Write an enzyme that holds these catalytic residues in place. Sequence first.
Site, short mmCIF file in Angstrom:
data_model
loop_
_atom_site.label_atom_id
_atom_site.label_comp_id
_atom_site.label_asym_id
_atom_site.label_seq_id
_atom_site.Cartn_x
_atom_site.Cartn_y
_atom_site.Cartn_z
N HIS A 68 0.87 -1.02 -0.31
CA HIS A 68 0.25 -0.58 -0.37
C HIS A 68 0.44 1.86 0.20
O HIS A 68 0.30 2.08 1.11
CB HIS A 68 -1.11 0.23 1.20
CG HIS A 68 -1.96 -0.70 1.22
ND1 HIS A 68 -2.28 -2.47 1.47
CD2 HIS A 68 -3.07 -0.49 0.20
CE1 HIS A 68 -3.53 -2.59 1.30
NE2 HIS A 68 -4.04 -1.79 0.60
N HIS A 72 1.36 0.98 -5.81
CA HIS A 72 0.20 1.18 -5.67
C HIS A 72 -0.14 2.38 -6.46
O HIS A 72 -1.63 2.30 -7.14
CB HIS A 72 -0.64 0.32 -4.79
CG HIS A 72 -1.57 0.50 -4.23
ND1 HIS A 72 -2.40 -0.68 -5.14
CD2 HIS A 72 -2.32 0.52 -3.87
CE1 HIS A 72 -3.85 -0.96 -4.63
NE2 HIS A 72 -3.61 0.01 -3.97
N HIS A 106 -5.74 7.69 -3.13
CA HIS A 106 -7.31 6.90 -2.67
C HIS A 106 -6.31 6.14 -1.31
O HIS A 106 -7.40 5.60 -0.53
CB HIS A 106 -7.65 5.56 -3.73
CG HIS A 106 -6.63 3.84 -3.51
ND1 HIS A 106 -5.95 4.24 -4.86
CD2 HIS A 106 -7.37 3.22 -3.39
CE1 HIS A 106 -5.43 3.68 -4.80
NE2 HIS A 106 -5.68 2.27 -3.89
N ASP A 107 -4.87 5.97 -0.98
CA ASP A 107 -4.66 5.19 0.21
C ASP A 107 -3.87 6.32 0.47
O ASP A 107 -3.08 5.33 1.26
CB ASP A 107 -4.02 3.68 -0.61
CG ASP A 107 -4.67 2.66 -0.17
OD1 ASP A 107 -5.82 2.00 0.41
OD2 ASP A 107 -4.74 1.85 -1.58
N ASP A 217 -8.36 -0.70 -8.49
CA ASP A 217 -7.72 -1.30 -6.95
C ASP A 217 -7.74 -2.29 -7.08
O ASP A 217 -6.17 -2.83 -5.63
CB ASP A 217 -9.13 -1.13 -6.07
CG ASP A 217 -7.90 -0.86 -4.17
OD1 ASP A 217 -6.95 -0.33 -4.36
OD2 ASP A 217 -8.37 -0.51 -3.07
N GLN A 269 -5.68 -17.64 -3.45
CA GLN A 269 -5.86 -16.97 -4.28
C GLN A 269 -6.82 -17.68 -5.27
O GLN A 269 -7.84 -15.83 -5.39
CB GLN A 269 -4.32 -17.14 -4.91
CG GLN A 269 -3.16 -15.49 -4.38
CD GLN A 269 -3.96 -14.67 -4.52
OE1 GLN A 269 -4.01 -13.72 -5.40
NE2 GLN A 269 -4.14 -14.05 -2.75
#
Length: 313
Positions: A68, A72, A106-107, A217, A269
């Site tokens: 993050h 990213h 956004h992060d 995202d 996953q």
Amino acid sequence: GLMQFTLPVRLCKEIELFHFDIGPFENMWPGIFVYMVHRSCGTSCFELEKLCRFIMSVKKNYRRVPYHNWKHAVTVAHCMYAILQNNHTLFTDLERKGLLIACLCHDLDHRGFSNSYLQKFDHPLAALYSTSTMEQHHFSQTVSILQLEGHNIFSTLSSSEYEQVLEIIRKAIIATDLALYFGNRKQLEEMYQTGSLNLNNQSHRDRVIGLMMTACDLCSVTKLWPVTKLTANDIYAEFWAEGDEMKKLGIQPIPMMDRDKKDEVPQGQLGFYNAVAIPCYTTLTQILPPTEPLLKACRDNLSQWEKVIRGEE
Ligand SMILES: Cc1c(C(F)F)nc2ccc(C#Cc3nc(-c4ccccc4)cn3C)nn12
Ligand SMILES: [Mg+2]
Ligand SMILES: [Zn+2]
């Protein structure tokens, strides 16, 4: 004024594709983002001196965590750029302006911990914002940076245009809370399949932009397999650190965050592609047909994780 950004040939061509990787040269990521604003929005959308100062402040407010991080942020903005360039006439001038900024921001100031860990640690942010804890924090950091001197990239918008753009950015950032994704996609599925979906209804646009945000995202599941596979290592490096921290508070983490259960990553996953990614890109392709390459690349990666399980890699 007449100062275009241009990229080397391989980047100039590959950046238009959904599966583009921004590369390991951090110093080129600002130029890549400016390039994307200039072609997505126009060379006049933002004052270059303000945009550059805004980008460098946003970068400084991302932390050195394994996933993050600043890479990213720019990666999620490039996915948004690809969606907007493949759906030219579907979006307003304000949406083009807002969404690339929303993605870059956004992060902001992420610590590599989930909303759940904040709540169990009893972090001050969990008392200030009881749902979408980190996401309300990211929007709050965005407004902060927007209010630094010489940083107001929206200075030329009217009072009511400024308020609309900050509202697009707020909803876009809140929608990256994956807890909110499940209900938003179900409603978009129902609305599409009964033919009620209406892009003139602002609450419908809101939901479509929400789903675009989840797709951007999660865009690490849509890259070439070696990018997808190596990014998964960063994603789990954070999950396992959170797991360690859960064990410190006296709590068994879920298996996703337990480094002791490393061996079952391939099966985990699989769950994630089937429960989250495949539905996301399926519903997105139905609403926005030119986004199909995201779904195709996602399916190719699920198929690579199946191969890992069968000992074929
Ligand atoms: C790839 C990716 C991205 C981004 F690339 F899109 N974002 C995310 C968010 C979540 C996950 C997961 C995941 C996951 N592992 C397990 C598991 C692992 C080991 C043992 C037992 C269980 C369970 N589960 C749901 N992957 N992910
Ligand atoms: Mg987030
Ligand atoms: Zn994110």
